[PDB]
Amino acid sequence: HLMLPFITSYKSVQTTLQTDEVKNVPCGTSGGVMIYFDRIEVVNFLVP
Amino acid sequence: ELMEAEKTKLLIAAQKQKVVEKEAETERKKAVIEAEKIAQVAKIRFQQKVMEKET
C-alpha cells in the first residue's frame, strides 16, 4: 500500500487471534491469605 | 495465616483418623491370633493332663 510521503504515519493493528499475559497477580482469599497467580494469559481477537 | 493452617490441619486429622483405625485393627487381629494360639496350646496341654491322670 502507498500513503503520503512524510506527513502520514501508519501503524498495523492485529485483527487475528493474539495472546498476552500478566505475571504475579495477587489474589486475596476469603480467609485473609494472599496467593499469587504466576501467570494469567488472555487470548483475544478484534473483528476487522 | 494461622486460621488457614487450622483449616488444613483438619484435613490431616481426617486421614490420621483412618491411619490410626487401620493400626488399631492390625493390633486387634494380632491379639486375636495370639488368643487362638493360647487356646490351642491349652487344648494340647489339657489332653496331656488327661493322659497324666490316666497314668
Curated annotation (Swiss-Prot), chain A:
Q: Where does the entry say this protein is expressed, by tissue?
A: Ubiquitous.
Top-level lineage group? Eukaryota
Q: How is it modified after translation?
A: Deubiquitinated by USP25; leading to stabilization.
> What subcellular locations does the record give?
Endoplasmic reticulum membrane
Q: Which family does it belong to?
A: Belongs to the band 7/mec-2 family.
Q: Which disorder is recorded?
A: Spastic paraplegia 18B, autosomal recessive: A form of spastic paraplegia, a neurodegenerative disorder characterized by a slow, gradual, progressive weakness and spasticity of the lower limbs. Rate of progression and the severity of symptoms are quite variable. Initial symptoms may include difficulty with balance, weakness and stiffness in the legs, muscle spasms, and dragging the toes when walking. In some forms of the disorder, bladder symptoms (such as incontinence) may appear, or the weakness and stiffness may spread to other parts of the body. Spastic paraplegia 18A, autosomal dominant: A form of spastic paraplegia, a neurodegenerative disorder characterized by a slow, gradual, progressive weakness and spasticity of the lower limbs. Rate of progression and the severity of symptoms are quite variable. Initial symptoms may include difficulty with balance, weakness and stiffness in the legs, muscle spasms, and dragging the toes when walking. In some forms of the disorder, bladder symptoms (such as incontinence) may appear, or the weakness and stiffness may spread to other parts of the body. SPG18A is a pure form.
The UniProt function text for this chain reads:
Component of the ERLIN1/ERLIN2 complex which mediates the endoplasmic reticulum-associated degradation (ERAD) of inositol 1,4,5-trisphosphate receptors (IP3Rs) such as ITPR1. Promotes sterol-accelerated ERAD of HMGCR probably implicating an AMFR/gp78-containing ubiquitin ligase complex. Involved in regulation of cellular cholesterol homeostasis by regulation the SREBP signaling pathway. May promote ER retention of the SCAP-SREBF complex.
Under the subunit heading, UniProt states:
Forms a heteromeric complex with ERLIN1. In complex with ERLIN1, interacts with RNF170. Interacts with activated ITPR1, independently of the degree of ITPR1 polyubiquitination. Interacts with SCAP, INSIG1, SREBF1 and SREBF2 under cholesterol sufficiency conditions; indicative for an association with the SCAP-SREBP-INSIG complex. Probably part of an AMFR/gp78 and INSIG1-containing ubiquitin ligase complex involved in ERAD of HMGCR. Interacts with TMUB1; TMUB1 bridges the association with AMFR. Interacts with SYVN1 and RNF139. Interacts with TMEM259. Interacts with TMEM41B.
The protein's name is Erlin-2
Q: Which organism is it from?
A: Homo sapiens (Human)
By which gene is this protein encoded? ERLIN2
Parent sequence residues shown? 50 to 97 of 339
UniProtKB/Swiss-Prot annotation, chain B:
Q: State the disease link.
A: Spastic paraplegia 62, autosomal recessive: A form of spastic paraplegia, a neurodegenerative disorder characterized by a slow, gradual, progressive weakness and spasticity of the lower limbs. Rate of progression and the severity of symptoms are quite variable. Initial symptoms may include difficulty with balance, weakness and stiffness in the legs, muscle spasms, and dragging the toes when walking. In some forms of the disorder, bladder symptoms (such as incontinence) may appear, or the weakness and stiffness may spread to other parts of the body.
The UniProt similarity line reads: Belongs to the band 7/mec-2 family.
The record's subunit annotation is: Forms a heteromeric complex with ERLIN2. In complex with ERLIN2, interacts with RNF170. Interacts with AMFR and SYVN1.
**PTM annotation:** Deubiquitinated by USP25; leading to stabilization.
- Name the cystine pairs: none
**Organism taxonomic ancestry:** Eukaryota, Metazoa, Chordata, Craniata, Vertebrata
This protein's superkingdom? Eukaryota
Q: Where is this chain's protein located in or outside the cell?
A: Endoplasmic reticulum membrane
Q: Please report the name of this protein according to its UniProt entry.
A: Erlin-1
- What does this chain do? Component of the ERLIN1/ERLIN2 complex which mediates the endoplasmic reticulum-associated degradation (ERAD) of inositol 1,4,5-trisphosphate receptors (IP3Rs). Involved in regulation of cellular cholesterol homeostasis by regulation the SREBP signaling pathway. Binds cholesterol and may promote ER retention of the SCAP-SREBF complex.
Q: In which tissues is it expressed?
A: Expressed in heart, placenta, liver, kidney, pancreas, prostate, testis, ovary and small intestine.
